[PDB]
Design a protein around this ligand. Sequence first.
Ligand SMILES: [Ca+2]
Ligand SMILES: [K+]
Ligand SMILES: [K+]
Ligand SMILES: [K+]
Ligand code: NA
Ligand code: NA
Ligand code: NA
Ligand code: NA
Ligand code: NA
Ligand code: NA
Ligand code: NA
Ligand code: NA
Ligand code: NA
Ligand code: NA
Ligand code: NA
Ligand code: NA
Ligand code: NA
Length: 702
Amino acid sequence: TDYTKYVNTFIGAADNGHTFPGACRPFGMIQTSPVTGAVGWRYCSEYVNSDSIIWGFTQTHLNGTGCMDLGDVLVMPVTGTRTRAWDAYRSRFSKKLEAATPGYYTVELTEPNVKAELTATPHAALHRYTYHNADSASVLIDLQHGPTWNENQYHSQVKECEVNWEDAQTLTGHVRNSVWVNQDYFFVMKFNRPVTDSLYLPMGETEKGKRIIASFDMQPGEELLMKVALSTTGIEGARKNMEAEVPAWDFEGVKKTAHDDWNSYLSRIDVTGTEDEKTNFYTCFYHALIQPNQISDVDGLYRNAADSVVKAGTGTFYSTFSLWDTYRAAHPFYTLMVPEKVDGFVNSLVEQSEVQGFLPIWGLWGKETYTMVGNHGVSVIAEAYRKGFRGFDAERAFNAIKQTQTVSHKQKSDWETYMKYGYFPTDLIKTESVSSSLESVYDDYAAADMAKRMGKTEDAAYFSKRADFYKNLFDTETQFMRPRNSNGTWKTPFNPSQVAHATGGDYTEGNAWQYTWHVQHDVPGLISLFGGEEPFLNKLDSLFTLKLETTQADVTGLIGQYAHGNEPSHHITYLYALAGRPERTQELVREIFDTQYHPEPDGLCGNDDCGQMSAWYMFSAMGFYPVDPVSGNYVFGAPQMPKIVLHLADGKTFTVIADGISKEHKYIDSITLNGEPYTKNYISHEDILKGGTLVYKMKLEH
Ligand SMILES: [Ca+2]
Ligand SMILES: [K+]
Ligand SMILES: [K+]
Ligand SMILES: [K+]
Ligand code: NA
Ligand code: NA
Ligand code: NA
Ligand code: NA
Ligand code: NA
Ligand code: NA
Ligand code: NA
Ligand code: NA
Ligand code: NA
Ligand code: NA
Ligand code: NA
Ligand code: NA
Ligand code: NA
């Protein structure tokens, strides 16, 4: 079966989603995709489905980020007049003739009257342009272009740019830009026809990039092929990358390689359901596998955070580690379904820690962006170790964890303050005091877990003490995780609904209603703080029913104050089950499936967040979720499709059956594992990997 047919790459091409529709390989360096715009300047995302103007095609993209992006090397077919203003090469296009499938994108560009087709290898983009008009057939190569939230930034974003025509078919160059991350890239670009003339357009005073119009001698209907390979290291690295992957001009072959690569992953799960269910699921699977992105050359060389070219220990170095999001479910998903990449990811995290002094917080292009809170590379490593991954040096990995959690670092990890108080005090830490505290607690728990498993008794005791610090922020009077002053008192006034954006506030992208539940490692301890299951459940009921009338304009993703697009919320629906009311978890997961994920461009409730929203969906569809990722226990909610078969790495299969699932039959009567009654509220990683059959008998009665 061809599972790629269920991937709709336009899903999430919207303000809520921030996906890209163009061609990439799983975990690749190239995401070659259209840049679109409308009227005025859009803050974020290079493509949205409602736009009807294409600026060109860039070679690098992040999937589902809030605003960070790469968007390097804009190319655009041009016909007619060669010299124009920088913004005058754009084109309308029809939706009818735009199409995509994993590894491939095509669109008809009305203005130049050119069809564009894009495919990709791990390090190269390959384009095929058909010039219906071949009048001064040309290509714009725009090295100034990049994704910025305003136009002033756009015209100043390049710090350095050098290009060279090596011959009539080959352009090479180097760009450094600054916006979201300090990025150096090098490229080799080749055309399959000789360039007959080239022109540099005049650049703005602050523009350090270049805009090149390259021309070709062509006739109507003729094709031009362009390939471009990138490198972090140098032009020779880019050349070697190209030679390894696109040595000639085999467009159909590259497209097929990409198709087959995607199917080699997607075929690891067989979903039975409606067409829409399969489209939702396989598109999620696709989104989860776009990143982390390989950025090393084919020989393992990469440019690291010290701006030095070095060799990856494993031969491959990855970045794009959106760890605040992904530690929660995307990383667990890789441990199950993409285990052969986990050791490589851990090695990449550790190597960068050894350069910068702490694990990547939000790693991009091998650099640090410091985005969001916590240090959740710690969870990823501890989880991998707990689950039996041994393709990394555990001593080096634990040293990275220990340095991360005990040596203070930017932007938020002031451990002297933290250990003085047992929390980050709101009066001393201007923003995110509570979110940074509670999220750091999880990392200390993870550190303790790995320490215990390595027999590091003293370290385990140290980190276990820190893992209890969540208790220091729970106000029993109001029953919220509440900001706390350095003098011990609670912050007043206190509005538990007030959303924080570091406008400021003590939480991250949310409020106390969400963060009160952020104790993934010790849900029993949190229940105890509440005074038992009954008051805990009463407070959850309030979370899911509280709507605000004077604020909170877009309620996108919200069920009361539960915010499905905000990652702190992702484990919350499962807390009902963990407090002895699983039928409510079952109802709520179904509600999320009914409302928050549809197989349409505008069908997502929120940005995909580098595969985290997608991994949430895939786990929840199977009926279990990693509330506590390091534990390797998956807490039951309810399956959402009739049957899901996992093909595991050793040839075993784990089959999930939602026996009798329907619109109203959404509750679980009973669970059997390998034919025997199963009464625990979770299933272990080990039990999944053993293979077999998990049958949820579905019912109406509740
Ligand atoms: Ca989010
Ligand atoms: K923009
Ligand atoms: K860039
Ligand atoms: K279409
Ligand atoms: Na425009
Ligand atoms: Na089109
Ligand atoms: Na011509
Ligand atoms: Na950049
Ligand atoms: Na021509
Ligand atoms: Na590189
Ligand atoms: Na994790
Ligand atoms: Na989690
Ligand atoms: Na992982
Ligand atoms: Na890395
Ligand atoms: Na990184
Ligand atoms: Na992990
Ligand atoms: Na979660």
